[PDB]
Amino acid sequence: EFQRKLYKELVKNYNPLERPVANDSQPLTVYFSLSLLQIMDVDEKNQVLTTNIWLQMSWTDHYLQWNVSEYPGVKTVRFPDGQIWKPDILLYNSADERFDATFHTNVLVNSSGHCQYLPPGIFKSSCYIDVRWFPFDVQHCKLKFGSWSYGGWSLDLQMQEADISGYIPNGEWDLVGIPGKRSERFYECCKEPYPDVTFTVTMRRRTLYYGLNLLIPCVLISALALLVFLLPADSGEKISLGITVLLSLTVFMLLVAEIMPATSDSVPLIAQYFASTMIIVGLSVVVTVIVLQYHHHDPDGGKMPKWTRVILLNWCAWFLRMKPDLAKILEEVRYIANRFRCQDESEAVCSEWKFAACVVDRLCLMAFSVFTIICTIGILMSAPNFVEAVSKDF
Amino acid sequence: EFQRKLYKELVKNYNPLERPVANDSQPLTVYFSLSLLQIMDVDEKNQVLTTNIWLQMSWTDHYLQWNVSEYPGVKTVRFPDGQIWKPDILLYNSADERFDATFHTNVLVNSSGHCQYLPPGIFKSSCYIDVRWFPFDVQHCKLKFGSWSYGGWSLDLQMQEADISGYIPNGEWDLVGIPGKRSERFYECCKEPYPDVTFTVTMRRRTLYYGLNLLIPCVLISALALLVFLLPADSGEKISLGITVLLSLTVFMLLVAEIMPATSDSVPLIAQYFASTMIIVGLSVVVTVIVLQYHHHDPDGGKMPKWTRVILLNWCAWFLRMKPDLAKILEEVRYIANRFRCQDESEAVCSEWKFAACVVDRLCLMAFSVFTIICTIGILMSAPNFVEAVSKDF
Amino acid sequence: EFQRKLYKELVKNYNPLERPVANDSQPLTVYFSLSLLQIMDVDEKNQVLTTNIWLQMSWTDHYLQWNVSEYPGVKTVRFPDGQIWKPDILLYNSADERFDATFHTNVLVNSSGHCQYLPPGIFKSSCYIDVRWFPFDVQHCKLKFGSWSYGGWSLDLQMQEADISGYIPNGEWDLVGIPGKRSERFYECCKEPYPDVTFTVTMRRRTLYYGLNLLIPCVLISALALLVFLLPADSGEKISLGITVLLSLTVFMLLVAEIMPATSDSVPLIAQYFASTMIIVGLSVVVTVIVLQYHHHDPDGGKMPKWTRVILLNWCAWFLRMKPDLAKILEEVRYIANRFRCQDESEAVCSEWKFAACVVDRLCLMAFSVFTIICTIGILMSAPNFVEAVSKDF
Amino acid sequence: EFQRKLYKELVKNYNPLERPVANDSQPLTVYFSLSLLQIMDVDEKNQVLTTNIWLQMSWTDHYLQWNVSEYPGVKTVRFPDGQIWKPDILLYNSADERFDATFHTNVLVNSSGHCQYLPPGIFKSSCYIDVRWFPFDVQHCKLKFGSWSYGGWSLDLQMQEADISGYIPNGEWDLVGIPGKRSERFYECCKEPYPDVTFTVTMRRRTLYYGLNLLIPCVLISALALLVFLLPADSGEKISLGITVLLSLTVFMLLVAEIMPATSDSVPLIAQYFASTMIIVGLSVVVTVIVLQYHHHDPDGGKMPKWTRVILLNWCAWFLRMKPDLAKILEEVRYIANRFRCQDESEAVCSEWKFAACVVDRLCLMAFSVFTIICTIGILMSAPNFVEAVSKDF
Amino acid sequence: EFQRKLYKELVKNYNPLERPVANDSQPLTVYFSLSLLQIMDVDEKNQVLTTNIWLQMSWTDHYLQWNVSEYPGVKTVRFPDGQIWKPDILLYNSADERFDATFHTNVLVNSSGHCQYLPPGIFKSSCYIDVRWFPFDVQHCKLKFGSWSYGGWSLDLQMQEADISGYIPNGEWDLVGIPGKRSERFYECCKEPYPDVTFTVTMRRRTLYYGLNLLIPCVLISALALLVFLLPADSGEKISLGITVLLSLTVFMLLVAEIMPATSDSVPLIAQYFASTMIIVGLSVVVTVIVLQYHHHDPDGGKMPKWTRVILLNWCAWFLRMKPDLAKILEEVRYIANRFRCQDESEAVCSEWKFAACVVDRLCLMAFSVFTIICTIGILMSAPNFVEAVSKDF
Ligand SMILES: *[C@@H]1O[C@H](CO)[C@@H](O)[C@H](O)[C@H]1NC(C)=O
Ligand SMILES: [Ca+2]
Numbered sequence A, B, C, D, E: 001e002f003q004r005k006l007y008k009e010l011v012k013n014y015n016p017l018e019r020p021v022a023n024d025s026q027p028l029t030v031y032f033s034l035s036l037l038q039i040m041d042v043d044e045k046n047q048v049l050t051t052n053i054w055l056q057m058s059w060t061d062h063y064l065q066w067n068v069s070e071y072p073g074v075k076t077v078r079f080p081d082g083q084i085w086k087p088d089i090l091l092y093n094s095a096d097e098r099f100d101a102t103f104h105t106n107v108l109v110n111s112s113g114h115c116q117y118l119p120p121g122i123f124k125s126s127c128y129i130d131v132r133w134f135p136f137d138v139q140h141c142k143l144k145f146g147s148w149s150y151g152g153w154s155l156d157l158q159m160q161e162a163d164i165s166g167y168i169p170n171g172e173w174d175l176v177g178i179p180g181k182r183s184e185r186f187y188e189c190c191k192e193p194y195p196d197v198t199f200t201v202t203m204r205r206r207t208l209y210y211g212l213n214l215l216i217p218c219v220l221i222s223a224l225a226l227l228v229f230l231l232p233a234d235s236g237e238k239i240s241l242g243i244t245v246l247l248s249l250t251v252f253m254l255l256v257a258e259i260m261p262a263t264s265d266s267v268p269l270i271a272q273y274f275a276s277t278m279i280i281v282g283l284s285v286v287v288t289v290i291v292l293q294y295h296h297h298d299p300d301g302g303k304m305p306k307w308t309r310v311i312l313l314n315w316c317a318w319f320l321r322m323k324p325d326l327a328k329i330l331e332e333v334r335y336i337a338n339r340f341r342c343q344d345e346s347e348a349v350c351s352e353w354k355f356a357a358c359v360v361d362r363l364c365l366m367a368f369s370v371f372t373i374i375c376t377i378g379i380l381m382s383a384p385n386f387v388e389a390v391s392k393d394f
């Protein structure tokens, strides 16, 4: 009886076009905040943050007021979209095809004319995802909000701290914080200044998934490549091992392209890490070819250089701690015996070449092993957030 | 005649904005339930449950009542969206881009003013999918429902048991149950408490598909890796077999990434199982390199250590149950014969090294076979639901 | 003049909320049928049938009637959505995110008050796709239609045979038929019975595409695996051939997962067929290892068992139809000659082992060839629709 | 002043439900045409043509007429959707989920009551894509348009030639033409005939992209397979080459499945071309096994058949243009010499077998080379549009 | 009080259908510009530019004017869609399924009747993406805008320079500029000329991502192929290396097809670059077969041609800087010695053939290395924007 009566009274002569101020010269104060419930998706390839947010808009409507002693029990009323004036606050950096992802809900108004509006929404925003340090990256995604059509002389937008009390954690992103800033800009369209409120979602990637599915594999594929330097040359499988490892690694790096954006702001950390890993496998194939050249050297070919004889078989090797009728019968047997002696000298020359191959193989094992460790450790720890990541996620 | 007459009468002065209570101070009781018809999709990568549900809302409208003796034959009326007051019950944890997936249908009202509203919908909800025990995982997906704008002082939301009598089973998920709980929370927005109703869909993954397409393959790819320990070394294909098996396995694990979310709450069970499988193939390649080192050992190189001579050729081997002119002619033939004897000693040394390779190869066959079984059995049965899964799905 | 006049008259006092019956106690008869124009997509992974349908609804509106002698030339009128009462017939088992895929069109009404409504639509329905016999599978997809809000006491839904006269055949699915059934169910929501009409689209997969792209390849990859049993062992490539074939086959089976649903109702026919094919390649690698063990047997190792000497070199082999100073010089040459004789005996032992490898290789060629044929023929013909498929598609 | 005045006058008593004819018995003539601006996508897997079209509808509204001497300067007026009667022309064979893709725009009306309506739209239509001759295929995609609810007695739909003057060429499809045909059909729903207008978009695939990315590769993968017949057998890599080529080819054919529909109307041309290519690689592996069998033949095994000795080493080979104490010492040396002679005879037998392998290898090189050329040329030129394609695209 | 009063006054008798001109004969001047905020996506496979734009429309409404001395403090008013006349400016070359991607916002009107309308939107436009020079390509994407229904006699559309002052740079595309052009065309539909405004977004691809992920790999896969010419032939792995490299490269080129459109306007630059790379690997396999033919030549086969003996072992080689009872015993030993001499001559012939293989191998190393460099450098630098790209991105 009193609710029906009040609704009929509150709409009499009410225009949702009118900004609901008592004094038309003064701006209307709109308090804008939001509640962050969930981060639904961070698309690094499309540069789009998807969040579940409850926008919070509160203002005062001069015309929607009543004495609660005359409509007893009616402390609040509710109005749908199109029936009450609302601030036209939009997400400026929207990525939604519809642009406005807000789900329009009721505006709750109490007797003193205070209006509360909390529309939910799945918001897609355009966020510059800096993948320079991926997977140890921290992201700062801005959500800029302001009135589209009402400038600062008509709508005085103020900011209230964002609420994260009902935030649901994400298994992939750690919410560092959601600081907000109110600013007033000028636009070429418009001499009047237009205030906006920007909430910067600060997000730390949780690195357990990427550590075990992307970074530890490369170590394993880098360790497999090093096993070529322990395969004997006579096995006949050092190129099979090395080139198969590089095939696997190339396929592995293709799968990684699915996640990164095709941008040129910087060369990511994963790309540098891949470059190091690529180098280990590519140069182990090059070195493997050299080792096979030494192993399969023709004993009747070019004699072993003096530099090769000393740098490998002496210095490196020590460092590595490797180390009538009867006359005619005589002629035939002597030819057979001299032939055998020639084979003995030739295979001794081959043995020297094979030993040099082993020394080169062992030298490069140590060199590639150490260089693998330094590049892995150096590239990873160059990330500012690596130490934080291992302490919090591992 | 009486239906036309009643519709004209029931809408006279009716305001869909008014909460349809006789006493404005009292809250309106809304009974909320739902019917679960089908689970359409569980997206573990996007963390979203898609269900086909018929929401069930029933309340009493004080103004939509008539005497059936005056409108004979008219026992019920129906009203579309916008013409009758409805509770603004939404899915709080919605993942739909539109947020509200409800398909608006009629409200059915009988003569005593009781209103029934059963809107269908394809609902997308944000469900935390715990993949710690995947593929033997049970999921608890919450569907939280409440009035967006009406707090507890205005809308007294009560819960009624969910209906699963028209539930259509899913080939992938077994519906354990759909328990529901009514709760009343406070929000930072609002001093007034807002009641909600949360239905927890409890779902057990049916594991036949994942057992045959994801878990039994790993056993087969783990068994293929073990066959390297039965290949002769002279075949020249033990690295080809081992490294090809690991290429296959890496490709296999790439395909598995398509299904899991990139989250860091925990390391899944499939990841641990893959880690065990990875270890078998990776260490069988490492052991294969060692076996080839033994097999291809240079007979003029470092003599066999005493530890190697006893630990392998004696202990392990027994355990494994393996086990003038005429003077010049004399000089030539004696050199030929002594040369042959030197080859005999050298190939005897090689035979010892080759036999040690066989013992190491057989030792690691047993060790990797047993360790493969324990890790497979141990990792799988560590899942709480493994025993239930095999009894119900296999 | 008469069309304008009639439209003004027909809408006077008309309420689209009112069920258009003369007697409010009696139900309104609605004849429901449909026209199937095309099957657009059968998504076996999402379990959703997409069809192009023209729903057919016809009823009688008591208020939309006129004498054609007073509005000459006006034999029919047309009304858009919202202006005329329509039955709220929905697809119960809808998979569309909007739930209602119907495109709202005009209702055509003639002078006697008969209303015809033929809204087109791209309908997505939830169909249980039984892949037990894929690719020789027949599907029965139900399309259940009924009034959402009007029960049997208010809307008497009758069924009329579906029309397929403008059906456009699908290159992948053969329309067996579209039988329909009217039924009346009770729901927990509602004491009143609610009639529905279910049209069961019966669809036979056309198997030419799947025969040539999925079943004949497996035969070719099963035939390639058999070629390992004709490769000589000295070629050194029997593991390369066998393990490469299994790599190809594994990749091939990954591509097949894209089409099947991750369900556990049954193990499909293609899975069983893959299991047979998997067995041929996996056991040919196991047998290849055994053949290489025999071929590369150490002539100074364990003597050939008596069971091996008879079961292979006799029975199987026959069945397979294979089959002073001068004294010192004497000592040296005799050692050389005796050494050569020892090599002759040892290589004779090796030749026996190599021959046993050939017999085992030929025995398994026949066994795997026959077993390959039986499993291929047996698994395929176990499908009830295999004979029909080959006669109609091949 | 005169525009405002005219709009108020033209809407007085106007009903958008009324067909705007002076005589209600006569049908209304609607001229239907369209403008083809672009072909946006041809989805051969979903069988859907996406086009950018400007529909062209023109008719005469009897009520929207004025004297331009009384509203000077007002030669035309414009009306939005819902305010003026429009023909309900739809795309019958629509594939859009909404069914109607038309973007509703103004209707332009001049003083004589002539109405022009040119709504743009991104139209998705169901087109039967005949892939029998892909990639040298010509497509005929129908776009059928007619009034949904107005039959021939009420709306006389006439056709006007389609406009392609603003057509933007597609890099993949060459617009042969867009002929149109007006027809009048009967439907089971309706005794009244319903006229339709069907525009057949005739499209020729431009084959440069598919020639270089799909057809020339197969030639290269067919040429690589032929190189197995020039590899020496002692290289030990003829199975590695052949089986790797077939692995590559299988992966290549998987990528091709992404483009073709899973239909059984016919076996496409690319499938036949793949079958030829598959045969070359598969039979080159089979022949490679036979060549290795000949090369690795046991010299103490079955003697060379007489058919083999003549068909290969003579006919084919010519055609191919290949071609006391001292007595005891005597016994030992004679055994050594006789042993060597036995090796010479045995390796001579092996040399004959190795030469037969070379002849078979060279015979199959020529046979597979010629057969490769004929199948490539024969399968490609069997397409009716192959000659046109090479002249226009190459 | 004055805002409420003004809104009631401004809408009195206002018709949003009327073009708001004082003189109905004169056209209405509409100033059209836009603001480019971000380029969201360039889809080269679908030929669609996605941009975030703020359209800028300004005109004068003759009826929406007031004296600010009578409504003090009210300097501007705002009107939503449907309440005020707006120009129906559309994107002609739209690719959006809805066609109109504009988000409708308020029109801001000041006291002198000047109207400002700045609707935001995510616009999808049909852009011809010329991939002739990809990845060093510059794109010119047109965005054509004009009134759909108002021709030049009714709406005089003028252009204002586009604003890029709030443009957010894209990590992949460098905004060269956004020039605009006003033009007036004639259409077959319409005798009246229709003005349009076309803004050409000029975009330069940033090439760092494509240089490191697509162009440098090909160099690495081209360098790996060259390593076959340094592998010894006795290693037995030159076909394994070469054919594995080509497998990797084929897989690499499959991944590249995901990005390019299936168009035939031209053969892209990446395709030509791939053709060069393909040639290096394919001809290195062909040359590898020839080298193996030389290496494995039968010493009892066709003698070395005179051309081969001079062109390789002399010219190329120098250029490359390579370089009673006792009588019977005599017969046996002489046969053994003569047999050994025959082996020495035969292996000397083999050594000559093996040396020729090395020379051919070294000759082709230099030839393929130089030819690889020229094709890489020549194909890349043939792009007009290559020099600009390396200076700006590298
Ligand atoms: C505007 O109003 C002021 C006072 O209200 C008056 O003096 C002036 O003449 C008016 N001018 C116009 C626009 O008629
Ligand atoms: Ca992410």
Ligand SMILES: [Ca+2]
Pocket: B041, B042, B043, B044, B172
């Ligand atoms: Ca699932």
Ligand SMILES: [Ca+2]
Pocket: C041, C042, C043, C044, C172
């Ligand atoms: Ca299908």
Ligand SMILES: [Ca+2]
Pocket: D041, D042, D043, D044, D172
């Ligand atoms: Ca196409």
Ligand SMILES: [Ca+2]
Pocket: E041, E042, E043, E044, E172
């Ligand atoms: Ca791009």
